[PDB]
Structure formats: C-alpha cells, structure tokens
C-alpha cells in the first residue's frame, strides 16, 4: 500500500580505521539505490581537517635541507599531509613541534591542545641525526571539504609574504575506502526485504555514526530543491 522507512542497526567497530555499519529495513532494491548513492557522498564530500600551512625554523622553501635531518624538507611536508588529527571547537589550530636529540620524531612529540587528538602518535614525521640538532615548527591545521591542492591556494595573495610559510596540499577528507554489500534480510513477516552492510575504511579521525548522519543530511538538502520545482533562476 504505502511505504517503509529504514534505520541503522549495529555499527560494529573493528579497527579505529575500518568498521562495518548495517541498515536492516530496506525494501526491494533500495539497498543498491542507497549503497551507491551513499558511497558517492561518502567518498567525496565528507568534512576533514588536514594540515595546510607549515612554517619551520631555518628553511626558506620546501626544496632545502636542514643540517641534521636525513629527510628533505619536501619529503617532510609530504609526511604531514598524512598526519591524521582531530579538533573539536576550533576550525583552525597551529601546533608547535619541538624535539632534538638523536632519534625518530613521531606525531606524539607535538604540544597538546584542548582540541588536539593525535590518532596516530607513532606516525613518523622525520628522523634526527645529530646529538644537539634541534627542530622547531609551526603547523597550521584547518578543516574543510574535498581536495584543495596548494596551487589553487595562491590567488588571494594580498601579502602572504612570510617566506617561511610553506603551504602543503590540502587533502581534507577522512574517508579512504567505501564498499557496500546488500545481502537479503528477511524480517520474519514481509515477503522480501533486504539488508545493507556498508564496510568503510577511515583515517581514524571520524566515528561511523557521526559521518553517516551528516552524509544523509546533505541528501535531503539537495533533494529539497528537487521536490517542488519552482523553475527558479
């Protein structure tokens, strides 16, 4: 006669990275109709906070070498693009990394902030090769959507002079891999209904339930215009 709405059942975490959420009450074929449409919005327009601007000590540009570190500055910038962090009430925060002495500099050697959560304290930023070699750096992290390469981030100019502010490419996004599988779920009485097993993969900076909601949020907002059609211009 009329219709049936779904809901999320067990969201089974496996790793901080990857997990399996499930949606039980799906009518015929809606598991596919959703799973791809959700995969679409899941992989792309999900908010994430990735490092943007990095100003270091003795370095004018990304093409130099710091005396005392076996990583070229360019390679250290690249390591940062893969640093996974999460903030809460700040939309951009600048982290100060300080360390010296022979050994690896991980992501746990930074300075903690109220909103700072380092999801991978073992993540390698660079090594340090000489007893009294010291590195201080200002790391500017912002939050956003999509992929903003460092190139498109030079048109506002208007005196971004600080010669030592090295921009990196913005990867803003948590999602790594999204896969959905629909196996037929029979609730005891209905002819045939289906399940939705959505298997995702994450950088550990977003919990599954938060994500899938804001995902679905955008949908009706885009369908909003879609419902009635005022021929607007």
């Amino acid at each position: 006669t009329e219709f049936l709405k779904p809901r999320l059942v067990d969201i089974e975490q496996v790793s901080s990275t990857h997990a399996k959420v499930t949606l039980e009450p799906l009518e015929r074929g809606f598991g596919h109709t959703l799973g791809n449409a959700l995969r679409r919005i899941l992989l792309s327009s999900m908010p994430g906070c990735a490092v943007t601007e990095v100003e270091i000590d003795g370095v004018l540009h990304e093409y130099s070498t710091k005396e005392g570190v076996q990583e070229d500055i360019l390679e250290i910038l690249l390591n940062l693009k893969g640093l996974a962090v999460r903030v809460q009430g700040k939309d951009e925060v600048i982290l100060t990394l300080n360390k010296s002495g022979i050994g690896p500099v991980t992501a746990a050697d930074i300075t903690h902030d109220g909103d700072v959560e380092i999801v991978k304290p073992q993540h390698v930023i660079c090594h340090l090769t000489d007893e009294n070699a010291s590195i201080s750096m200002r790391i500017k992290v912002q939050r956003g959507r999509g992929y903003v390469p460092a190139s498109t981030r030079i048109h506002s100019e208007e005196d971004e002079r600080p010669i030592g502010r090295l921009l990196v490419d913005a990867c803003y996004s948590p999602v790594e891999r999204i896969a959905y599988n629909v196996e037929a779920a029979r609730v005891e009485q209905r002819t045939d209904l289906d399940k939705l097993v959505i298997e995702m993969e994450t950088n550990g900076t977003i919990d599954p339930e938060e994500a899938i909601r804001r995902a679905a949020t955008i949908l009706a907002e885009q369908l909003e215009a879609f419902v009635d059609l005022r021929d607007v211009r």
Binding site: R39, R40, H61, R177, I178, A179, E199
Partner: protein, 50 residues
Amino acid sequence: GVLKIVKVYLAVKRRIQPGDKMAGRHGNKGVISKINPIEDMPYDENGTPV
C-alpha cells in the same frame, strides 16, 4: 658587452593534467583525457577503486 648577469633558478612543480603523454613499457602511448573523481571510478566488490 655584458656588464653583469643574474641567473635565477625556479623550481616549478607540475602534477598531471589532461594532455600529458603517458605510456607503458609495451609501446602503448596515451594522452590523459579526463581526470575523474573516485566516485565515478569502477570498483570491485571489496570496494577498492581502480
């Protein structure tokens, strides 16, 4: 005739865009046509795009 010379060295970083020529080792040339989102990318059952 030359009094002084200033040689400046620029390091440009170019990535990839439609029009670059790419080829495998087997003599298959190619010119990248479109740069596609991961959303439109073919994926296998496990969900890993290509």
